[PDB]
Design a protein around this ligand. Structure first.
Ligand code: GNZ
Lengths: 193, 191
């Protein structure tokens, strides 16, 4: 009962670590069971299959991505919605550049969940924060009154591509610097502030 | 000879998948539309996804040719107006039901995000980098990294079309999305 609850946490922790390091395709459930110090039967009781355990890993990784974005925006000192947006764009490049986030969210998740599953999880975690920053900037008069959800969706498409471009670049250090420059120019062209 | 079988199969698949979606039409029904046997089809395409990859190629080639046609007909007088016209051209062509079904709905599912991006970039990066470079040369866009800006714009415009494609009210989503893209592009350009 308590041991099972503890087994579920140990399996998610161990899978996150090993798949974070080597990728979904390169670590099997037996090696994860051993990492967690539990039997195959205890694992199979919690997770029907490998993809089921991956879905729960993506959840805790996405929760941590969104918590780290909120932390970096709160840590930026941003005094205006316009500066909160600037800080959030920089925070996304920072968080998405974490090697575990790159491996699990940008490379493995779209493959293992498939397109519809991956976008549903991506939207559930990102749309709320994006729409909130936009709505605050509009209320402050730092962004033109306009449909919130369409602007949110277009910016998510831009920011998703920015992360994937850096994730797969020959020189990610240069790609990240130049992509940050491009995004900053784009938002500074729309922000009244 | 193989060429003729492949052309018939790609044409038939484009038509039927265009109409009902990848999920709803099997290779035997495509074989019949093409007037070829299952054996001749399977010789050319190991599986359904293989034929879909060749359909996406021909459709994206046609999309980019139609966009170049609409930009030529727009009367755009400056590189800035060429970019505005290309965005309007993509919103126009993306509303073609076959393009919506094959590129916006089926292609991301069948190819995945990495496969979809690869095809998107192969067909649009060249033209997008050209428009950006001409706008920079004309002094209508700040000197900045061309490839990164191209990639971000491609990702933004592809997402805009998918948002419209799956919206409860696509007429309203298209109008509001066009308004958003206009503000984003106009914020990007000088004068
Ligand atoms: O066949 C296609 C159409 C869609 C779907 C995949 C990829 C290639 N994509 C290109 C979208 C695009 C539109 C306009 C501009 C421009 F030129 F206006 F900046 C760039 C890219």
């Amino acid at each position: 009962e308590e041991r099972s609850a503890a087994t579920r946490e140990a399996l998610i922790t161990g899978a996150r670590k090993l798949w974070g390091l080597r990728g979904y395709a390169e670590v099997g459930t037996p090696e994860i069971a051993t990492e967690a110090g539990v039997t195959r039967g205890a694992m199979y009781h919690q997770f029907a299959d490998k993809a089921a355990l991956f879905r729960d890993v993506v959840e805790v990784v996405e929760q941590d991505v969104m918590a780290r974005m909120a932390t970096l925006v709160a840590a930026s000192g941003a005094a205006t919605p316009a500066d909160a947006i600037r800080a959030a764009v920089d925070a996304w490049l920072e968080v998405s550049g974490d090697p575990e986030v790159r491996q699990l969210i940008l490379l493995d998740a779209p493959v293992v969940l498939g397109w519809a599953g991956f976008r549903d999880v991506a939207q559930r975690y990102s749309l709320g924060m994006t729409e909130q920053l936009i709505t605050e900037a509009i209320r402050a008069g730092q962004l033109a009154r306009q449909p919130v959800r369409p602007l949110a969706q277009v910016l998510i498409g831009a920011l998703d591509e920015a992360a994937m471009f850096i994730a797969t670049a020959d020189d990610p250090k240069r790609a990240r610097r130049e992509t940050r420059q491009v995004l900053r120019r784009l938002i500074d062209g729309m922000l009244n502030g």
